PDB file of C-alpha atoms and ligand atoms in Angstrom:
ATOM      1  CA  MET L  22     103.800 105.668 157.330  1.00 36.00           C
ATOM      2  CA  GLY L  23     100.490 106.878 157.428  1.00 37.13           C
ATOM      3  CA  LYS L  24      99.023 108.019 160.521  1.00 36.62           C
ATOM      4  CA  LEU L  25      95.601 109.342 161.521  1.00 35.92           C
ATOM      5  CA  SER L  26      95.148 111.830 164.966  1.00 32.71           C
ATOM      6  CA  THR L  27      93.097 113.974 166.878  1.00 32.70           C
ATOM      7  CA  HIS L  28      92.880 116.609 169.454  1.00 30.91           C
ATOM      8  CA  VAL L  29      90.287 118.002 171.462  1.00 33.76           C
ATOM      9  CA  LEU L  30      90.362 121.478 172.826  1.00 34.44           C
ATOM     10  CA  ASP L  31      87.525 122.926 175.081  1.00 32.94           C
ATOM     11  CA  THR L  32      86.747 126.705 173.977  1.00 31.10           C
ATOM     12  CA  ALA L  33      84.588 127.285 176.462  1.00 31.16           C
ATOM     13  CA  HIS L  34      87.158 127.074 179.226  1.00 32.81           C
ATOM     14  CA  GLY L  35      90.556 127.547 177.643  1.00 33.21           C
ATOM     15  CA  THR L  36      91.848 123.924 178.680  1.00 30.15           C
ATOM     16  CA  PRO L  37      92.596 120.678 176.098  1.00 28.80           C
ATOM     17  CA  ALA L  38      89.165 118.236 176.608  1.00 28.06           C
ATOM     18  CA  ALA L  39      90.212 115.463 178.593  1.00 27.54           C
ATOM     19  CA  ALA L  40      88.739 112.656 179.662  1.00 28.00           C
ATOM     20  CA  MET L  41      86.117 112.916 176.318  1.00 25.13           C
ATOM     21  CA  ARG L  42      85.106 109.514 174.954  1.00 24.45           C
ATOM     22  CA  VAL L  43      85.880 109.100 171.251  1.00 22.15           C
ATOM     23  CA  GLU L  44      84.650 106.199 168.577  1.00 23.67           C
ATOM     24  CA  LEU L  45      86.163 105.849 165.155  1.00 27.89           C
ATOM     25  CA  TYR L  46      84.173 104.177 162.427  1.00 28.40           C
ATOM     26  CA  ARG L  47      84.856 103.605 158.694  1.00 30.65           C
ATOM     27  CA  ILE L  48      82.094 104.290 156.755  1.00 31.89           C
ATOM     28  CA  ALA L  49      81.298 101.123 154.316  1.00 31.71           C
ATOM     29  CA  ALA L  50      80.229 100.984 150.868  1.00 30.06           C
ATOM     30  CA  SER L  51      77.176 100.000 151.668  1.00 28.93           C
ATOM     31  CA  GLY L  52      77.271 103.477 153.644  1.00 27.56           C
ATOM     32  CA  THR L  53      76.912 101.385 156.949  1.00 27.14           C
ATOM     33  CA  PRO L  54      79.268 102.474 159.585  1.00 27.93           C
ATOM     34  CA  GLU L  55      81.654  99.793 161.000  1.00 24.96           C
ATOM     35  CA  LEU L  56      83.399 100.439 164.411  1.00 25.37           C
ATOM     36  CA  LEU L  57      87.009 100.063 164.361  1.00 29.84           C
ATOM     37  CA  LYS L  58      87.839 101.766 167.984  1.00 29.64           C
ATOM     38  CA  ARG L  59      86.762 103.106 171.228  1.00 34.46           C
ATOM     39  CA  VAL L  60      89.072 105.725 173.014  1.00 34.71           C
ATOM     40  CA  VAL L  61      89.436 107.999 175.704  1.00 32.61           C
ATOM     41  CA  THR L  62      91.118 111.609 175.206  1.00 30.31           C
ATOM     42  CA  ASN L  63      94.038 111.934 177.654  1.00 30.02           C
ATOM     43  CA  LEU L  64      95.218 115.022 179.550  1.00 27.03           C
ATOM     44  CA  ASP L  65      96.118 116.880 176.329  1.00 27.38           C
ATOM     45  CA  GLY L  66      92.956 116.286 174.672  1.00 23.66           C
ATOM     46  CA  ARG L  67      94.983 113.306 172.976  1.00 22.68           C
ATOM     47  CA  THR L  68      94.903 109.501 172.263  1.00 21.61           C
ATOM     48  CA  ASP L  69      97.842 107.955 174.011  1.00 21.71           C
ATOM     49  CA  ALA L  70      98.072 106.192 170.189  1.00 17.46           C
ATOM     50  CA  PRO L  71      97.505 107.125 167.251  1.00 19.38           C
ATOM     51  CA  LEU L  72      93.640 106.347 165.655  1.00 20.32           C
ATOM     52  CA  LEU L  73      95.100 104.934 163.040  1.00 23.35           C
ATOM     53  CA  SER L  74      98.723 103.987 162.017  1.00 22.25           C
ATOM     54  CA  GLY L  75     100.945 101.622 159.459  1.00 23.41           C
ATOM     55  CA  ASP L  76      98.739  99.263 158.112  1.00 21.45           C
ATOM     56  CA  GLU L  77      95.673 100.534 160.179  1.00 21.71           C
ATOM     57  CA  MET L  78      95.524 103.428 157.630  1.00 20.76           C
ATOM     58  CA  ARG L  79      93.333 102.215 154.298  1.00 22.94           C
ATOM     59  CA  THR L  80      91.712 105.098 151.924  1.00 24.27           C
ATOM     60  CA  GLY L  81      88.062 105.393 152.108  1.00 24.79           C
ATOM     61  CA  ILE L  82      85.430 107.551 154.279  1.00 24.18           C
ATOM     62  CA  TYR L  83      85.664 107.765 158.203  1.00 20.79           C
ATOM     63  CA  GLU L  84      83.863 109.305 161.078  1.00 18.89           C
ATOM     64  CA  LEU L  85      85.114 110.235 164.290  1.00 18.64           C
ATOM     65  CA  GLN L  86      82.351 110.663 167.012  1.00 21.99           C
ATOM     66  CA  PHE L  87      82.822 112.765 169.885  1.00 22.48           C
ATOM     67  CA  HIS L  88      80.780 112.360 173.082  1.00 23.94           C
ATOM     68  CA  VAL L  89      80.897 116.228 173.708  1.00 20.63           C
ATOM     69  CA  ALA L  90      77.462 116.418 175.743  1.00 18.82           C
ATOM     70  CA  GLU L  91      78.454 113.925 178.518  1.00 23.61           C
ATOM     71  CA  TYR L  92      82.424 115.941 178.666  1.00 25.33           C
ATOM     72  CA  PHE L  93      80.328 119.530 179.258  1.00 24.49           C
ATOM     73  CA  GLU L  94      77.548 117.741 181.468  1.00 23.41           C
ATOM     74  CA  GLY L  95      80.745 116.406 183.610  1.00 22.63           C
ATOM     75  CA  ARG L  96      82.203 120.184 183.532  1.00 21.67           C
ATOM     76  CA  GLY L  97      79.040 121.338 185.094  1.00 23.79           C
ATOM     77  CA  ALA L  98      77.405 122.888 181.912  1.00 24.03           C
ATOM     78  CA  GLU L  99      73.615 123.554 182.299  1.00 24.11           C
ATOM     79  CA  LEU L 100      72.725 121.846 179.225  1.00 20.98           C
ATOM     80  CA  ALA L 101      68.431 122.040 177.666  1.00 20.36           C
ATOM     81  CA  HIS L 102      66.956 118.570 178.160  1.00 21.12           C
ATOM     82  CA  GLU L 103      67.858 117.576 174.579  1.00 18.35           C
ATOM     83  CA  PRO L 104      71.349 119.444 174.298  1.00 16.05           C
ATOM     84  CA  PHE L 105      72.239 121.837 171.410  1.00 16.69           C
ATOM     85  CA  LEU L 106      75.017 119.158 170.782  1.00 16.04           C
ATOM     86  CA  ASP L 107      75.190 115.774 172.250  1.00 14.17           C
ATOM     87  CA  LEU L 108      77.371 113.379 169.829  1.00 15.41           C
ATOM     88  CA  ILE L 109      79.024 115.330 167.333  1.00 13.81           C
ATOM     89  CA  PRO L 110      80.297 113.327 163.728  1.00 15.62           C
ATOM     90  CA  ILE L 111      83.162 114.204 162.239  1.00 14.35           C
ATOM     91  CA  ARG L 112      83.192 112.362 158.720  1.00 15.46           C
ATOM     92  CA  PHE L 113      85.876 112.802 156.386  1.00 16.64           C
ATOM     93  CA  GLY L 114      88.342 110.907 153.725  1.00 16.91           C
ATOM     94  CA  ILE L 115      91.612 109.457 153.408  1.00 18.67           C
ATOM     95  CA  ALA L 116      93.237 109.608 150.479  1.00 16.99           C
ATOM     96  CA  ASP L 117      96.877 108.984 150.965  1.00 18.18           C
ATOM     97  CA  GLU L 118      97.658 105.750 152.884  1.00 20.27           C
ATOM     98  CA  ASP L 119     100.990 107.362 153.440  1.00 19.81           C
ATOM     99  CA  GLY L 120      99.846 110.362 154.347  1.00 20.54           C
ATOM    100  CA  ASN L 121      99.414 112.004 158.168  1.00 20.95           C
ATOM    101  CA  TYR L 122      95.852 113.430 158.799  1.00 21.23           C
ATOM    102  CA  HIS L 123      95.693 115.163 161.924  1.00 19.64           C
ATOM    103  CA  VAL L 124      92.147 116.758 162.478  1.00 19.46           C
ATOM    104  CA  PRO L 125      91.610 119.079 165.697  1.00 21.72           C
ATOM    105  CA  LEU L 126      88.260 119.475 167.372  1.00 21.11           C
ATOM    106  CA  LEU L 127      87.706 123.049 169.043  1.00 23.71           C
ATOM    107  CA  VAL L 128      84.248 122.595 171.048  1.00 23.05           C
ATOM    108  CA  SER L 129      82.505 124.454 173.307  1.00 26.53           C
ATOM    109  CA  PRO L 130      78.549 123.589 174.254  1.00 28.79           C
ATOM    110  CA  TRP L 131      77.138 125.182 171.607  1.00 25.32           C
ATOM    111  CA  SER L 132      80.233 125.757 168.745  1.00 23.86           C
ATOM    112  CA  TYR L 133      82.767 123.823 167.131  1.00 25.44           C
ATOM    113  CA  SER L 134      84.982 123.500 164.549  1.00 28.16           C
ATOM    114  CA  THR L 135      87.389 121.440 162.767  1.00 32.08           C
ATOM    115  CA  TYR L 136      90.108 121.007 159.822  1.00 30.65           C
ATOM    116  CA  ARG L 137      92.938 119.261 158.687  1.00 31.76           C
ATOM    117  CA  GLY L 138      95.894 120.259 160.441  1.00 32.29           C
ATOM    118  CA  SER L 139      99.468 119.408 160.572  1.00 32.45           C
TER     119      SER L 139
ATOM    120  CA  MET A  22      55.967 130.301 166.687  1.00 33.98           C
ATOM    121  CA  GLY A  23      59.558 128.146 166.341  1.00 33.59           C
ATOM    122  CA  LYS A  24      62.006 127.529 163.214  1.00 35.17           C
ATOM    123  CA  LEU A  25      64.640 126.052 162.249  1.00 34.87           C
ATOM    124  CA  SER A  26      67.300 127.543 159.382  1.00 33.79           C
ATOM    125  CA  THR A  27      70.622 127.676 157.993  1.00 37.10           C
ATOM    126  CA  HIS A  28      72.967 129.931 155.814  1.00 38.46           C
ATOM    127  CA  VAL A  29      76.161 128.289 154.361  1.00 40.43           C
ATOM    128  CA  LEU A  30      79.497 130.779 154.167  1.00 37.38           C
ATOM    129  CA  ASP A  31      82.126 129.621 151.439  1.00 39.44           C
ATOM    130  CA  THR A  32      85.337 130.969 153.895  1.00 38.21           C
ATOM    131  CA  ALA A  33      87.323 129.645 150.741  1.00 37.39           C
ATOM    132  CA  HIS A  34      86.189 132.497 148.641  1.00 37.75           C
ATOM    133  CA  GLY A  35      84.401 134.984 150.892  1.00 35.80           C
ATOM    134  CA  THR A  36      80.962 134.581 149.660  1.00 35.71           C
ATOM    135  CA  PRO A  37      77.693 132.792 150.703  1.00 36.27           C
ATOM    136  CA  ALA A  38      77.517 128.776 149.061  1.00 33.86           C
ATOM    137  CA  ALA A  39      74.828 129.588 147.102  1.00 33.76           C
ATOM    138  CA  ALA A  40      73.651 126.262 144.781  1.00 38.76           C
ATOM    139  CA  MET A  41      74.560 123.826 147.619  1.00 37.02           C
ATOM    140  CA  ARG A  42      72.867 120.679 148.075  1.00 34.46           C
ATOM    141  CA  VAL A  43      71.519 120.108 151.601  1.00 29.70           C
ATOM    142  CA  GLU A  44      69.382 117.613 153.332  1.00 30.07           C
ATOM    143  CA  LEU A  45      67.292 117.465 156.842  1.00 28.54           C
ATOM    144  CA  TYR A  46      67.243 114.328 158.798  1.00 23.03           C
ATOM    145  CA  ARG A  47      65.179 113.330 161.802  1.00 24.97           C
ATOM    146  CA  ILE A  48      67.158 110.957 163.729  1.00 25.85           C
ATOM    147  CA  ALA A  49      64.619 108.028 165.116  1.00 25.73           C
ATOM    148  CA  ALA A  50      64.922 106.817 168.866  1.00 24.35           C
ATOM    149  CA  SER A  51      66.132 103.695 167.201  1.00 24.62           C
ATOM    150  CA  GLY A  52      68.956 106.000 165.569  1.00 21.50           C
ATOM    151  CA  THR A  53      68.150 105.600 161.556  1.00 21.23           C
ATOM    152  CA  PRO A  54      67.791 108.767 160.051  1.00 14.41           C
ATOM    153  CA  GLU A  55      64.812 109.682 158.725  1.00 13.01           C
ATOM    154  CA  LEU A  56      64.561 112.085 155.565  1.00 11.09           C
ATOM    155  CA  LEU A  57      62.559 115.129 156.384  1.00  9.31           C
ATOM    156  CA  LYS A  58      63.688 117.505 153.163  1.00  6.47           C
ATOM    157  CA  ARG A  59      66.118 118.085 150.435  1.00  5.78           C
ATOM    158  CA  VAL A  60      66.702 122.050 149.715  1.00  4.24           C
ATOM    159  CA  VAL A  61      68.849 123.516 147.428  1.00  7.21           C
ATOM    160  CA  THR A  62      70.846 126.934 148.867  1.00  6.29           C
ATOM    161  CA  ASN A  63      70.037 130.244 147.502  1.00  7.35           C
ATOM    162  CA  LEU A  64      72.310 132.795 146.061  1.00  9.41           C
ATOM    163  CA  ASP A  65      73.141 134.305 150.047  1.00 11.51           C
ATOM    164  CA  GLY A  66      73.673 130.368 151.263  1.00 10.33           C
ATOM    165  CA  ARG A  67      69.984 130.343 152.572  1.00 11.44           C
ATOM    166  CA  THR A  68      66.506 128.401 151.754  1.00  9.41           C
ATOM    167  CA  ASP A  69      63.874 129.963 150.346  1.00 11.26           C
ATOM    168  CA  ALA A  70      61.382 128.429 152.995  1.00  9.62           C
ATOM    169  CA  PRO A  71      62.883 127.389 156.529  1.00 11.68           C
ATOM    170  CA  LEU A  72      64.413 123.998 156.799  1.00 15.84           C
ATOM    171  CA  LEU A  73      60.821 123.631 159.627  1.00 14.36           C
ATOM    172  CA  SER A  74      58.664 125.858 160.134  1.00 16.22           C
ATOM    173  CA  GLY A  75      56.579 126.242 163.390  1.00 18.49           C
ATOM    174  CA  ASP A  76      54.116 123.687 162.318  1.00 19.68           C
ATOM    175  CA  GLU A  77      56.574 120.808 161.551  1.00 17.36           C
ATOM    176  CA  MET A  78      58.953 121.975 164.282  1.00 18.45           C
ATOM    177  CA  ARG A  79      59.613 118.836 167.084  1.00 14.71           C
ATOM    178  CA  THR A  80      61.837 118.294 169.647  1.00 13.20           C
ATOM    179  CA  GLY A  81      64.524 115.752 169.072  1.00 13.10           C
ATOM    180  CA  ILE A  82      67.924 115.072 167.882  1.00 15.00           C
ATOM    181  CA  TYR A  83      68.518 116.434 163.734  1.00 16.30           C
ATOM    182  CA  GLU A  84      70.564 116.275 161.062  1.00 12.57           C
ATOM    183  CA  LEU A  85      71.970 118.468 158.332  1.00 11.99           C
ATOM    184  CA  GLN A  86      73.854 116.765 155.503  1.00 12.99           C
ATOM    185  CA  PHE A  87      75.743 119.024 153.431  1.00 13.33           C
ATOM    186  CA  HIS A  88      77.228 118.277 150.078  1.00 10.09           C
ATOM    187  CA  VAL A  89      80.294 120.675 150.145  1.00  9.26           C
ATOM    188  CA  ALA A  90      82.835 118.423 147.848  1.00  9.10           C
ATOM    189  CA  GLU A  91      80.254 118.712 144.486  1.00 10.09           C
ATOM    190  CA  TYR A  92      79.544 122.808 145.541  1.00  9.89           C
ATOM    191  CA  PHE A  93      83.840 122.792 145.294  1.00 11.05           C
ATOM    192  CA  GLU A  94      84.185 120.466 142.738  1.00 10.62           C
ATOM    193  CA  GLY A  95      81.975 122.997 140.518  1.00 12.78           C
ATOM    194  CA  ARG A  96      83.566 125.861 141.855  1.00  8.64           C
ATOM    195  CA  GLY A  97      86.680 124.598 140.628  1.00 10.65           C
ATOM    196  CA  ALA A  98      88.214 122.985 143.353  1.00 11.97           C
ATOM    197  CA  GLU A  99      91.408 120.512 143.042  1.00 10.79           C
ATOM    198  CA  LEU A 100      90.298 117.651 145.388  1.00  7.84           C
ATOM    199  CA  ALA A 101      91.992 114.521 146.179  1.00  4.81           C
ATOM    200  CA  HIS A 102      90.228 111.132 144.821  1.00  2.72           C
ATOM    201  CA  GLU A 103      88.978 110.861 147.897  1.00  4.37           C
ATOM    202  CA  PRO A 104      88.104 114.326 149.188  1.00  2.87           C
ATOM    203  CA  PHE A 105      89.118 115.385 152.294  1.00  5.81           C
ATOM    204  CA  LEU A 106      85.371 116.613 153.062  1.00  2.97           C
ATOM    205  CA  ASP A 107      82.699 115.215 150.777  1.00  2.00           C
ATOM    206  CA  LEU A 108      79.348 115.101 152.855  1.00  4.58           C
ATOM    207  CA  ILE A 109      78.976 117.058 156.154  1.00  5.53           C
ATOM    208  CA  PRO A 110      76.937 115.732 158.748  1.00  4.91           C
ATOM    209  CA  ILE A 111      75.907 118.243 161.448  1.00  3.43           C
ATOM    210  CA  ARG A 112      74.103 116.583 164.329  1.00  5.23           C
ATOM    211  CA  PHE A 113      72.102 118.681 166.817  1.00  8.02           C
ATOM    212  CA  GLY A 114      69.096 119.096 169.345  1.00 10.15           C
ATOM    213  CA  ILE A 115      66.118 120.650 169.341  1.00 10.41           C
ATOM    214  CA  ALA A 116      64.902 121.296 173.312  1.00  6.45           C
ATOM    215  CA  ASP A 117      61.970 123.481 172.374  1.00  6.38           C
ATOM    216  CA  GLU A 118      59.400 123.269 169.504  1.00  7.92           C
ATOM    217  CA  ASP A 119      58.519 127.345 169.944  1.00 10.24           C
ATOM    218  CA  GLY A 120      62.368 128.209 169.537  1.00  8.74           C
ATOM    219  CA  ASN A 121      64.458 129.933 166.723  1.00 11.72           C
ATOM    220  CA  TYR A 122      66.823 127.601 165.907  1.00 12.14           C
ATOM    221  CA  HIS A 123      69.809 129.107 163.253  1.00 14.84           C
ATOM    222  CA  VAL A 124      72.492 126.593 162.439  1.00 14.77           C
ATOM    223  CA  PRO A 125      74.925 128.586 160.469  1.00 13.32           C
ATOM    224  CA  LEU A 126      77.698 126.526 158.610  1.00 12.30           C
ATOM    225  CA  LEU A 127      81.071 128.489 157.619  1.00 14.04           C
ATOM    226  CA  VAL A 128      83.182 126.037 154.838  1.00  8.40           C
ATOM    227  CA  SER A 129      86.292 125.260 152.951  1.00  3.97           C
ATOM    228  CA  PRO A 130      87.171 121.827 151.460  1.00  4.24           C
ATOM    229  CA  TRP A 131      90.035 121.774 154.454  1.00  3.26           C
ATOM    230  CA  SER A 132      87.857 123.155 157.462  1.00  4.64           C
ATOM    231  CA  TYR A 133      84.910 124.119 158.508  1.00  5.37           C
ATOM    232  CA  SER A 134      82.584 125.418 162.060  1.00  7.27           C
ATOM    233  CA  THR A 135      79.088 125.561 163.096  1.00  9.19           C
ATOM    234  CA  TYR A 136      77.508 127.304 166.025  1.00  9.71           C
ATOM    235  CA  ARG A 137      74.080 128.102 167.561  1.00 10.67           C
ATOM    236  CA  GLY A 138      73.096 131.322 165.824  1.00 10.13           C
ATOM    237  CA  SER A 139      71.387 134.035 167.877  1.00 10.26           C
TER     238      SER A 139
HETATM  239 CL1   CL V   1      71.869 122.897 174.928  1.00 12.85          CL
HETATM  240 CL1   CL V   2      70.817 130.564 160.138  1.00 12.04          CL
HETATM  241 CL1   CL V   3      90.881 116.978 149.529  1.00 10.31          CL
END
């Protein structure tokens, strides 16, 4: 049934963003983020398993956190001592536990974009 | 000297996003957000005073939080009971307290993008 997935594209270089660290949180009632998963993007900028699947899918507010400065510094980027982008949180809601939520991230060290894809 | 500003564009309607609620946080060393300012966007989707003025600027990590579902709901959007986008956090670093930082946001209820402006 339901599924959550992501796909990270490096727009500075025109490649998938491989070997990027990402964490998934569920934002609790209190507002406190509960860590669900730590993952790494594969060679195609995706994950080898869905972020959420089947019974894991629950309606609510979630947040993905992407380690973008780490990725770009590894790739050779020269960033400021305090980078403009370091950790990027993408906060979003899941309304349909049976829905397929695909959330791509396009990123450079000084810009990013995201959307509900398909 | 330095300054922090924002500019919100509603890409679902092709207009500046006026009357959107936004808050600015400084992220402390501990990781806990400290609220610095609450603001409302003006007719041009900007703020009537800078988010941070010269005297207020400090290097470090910041986060703007945009109340996007409230904005779009008022404009008549058909959102899910749990909206795909509700609060959007934009986390970024300031490396130079004398620098001019612009953080524009482009947003629809199902997409957004941001970048370090010039
Ligand atoms: Cl930088
Ligand atoms: Cl701006
Ligand atoms: Cl929605």
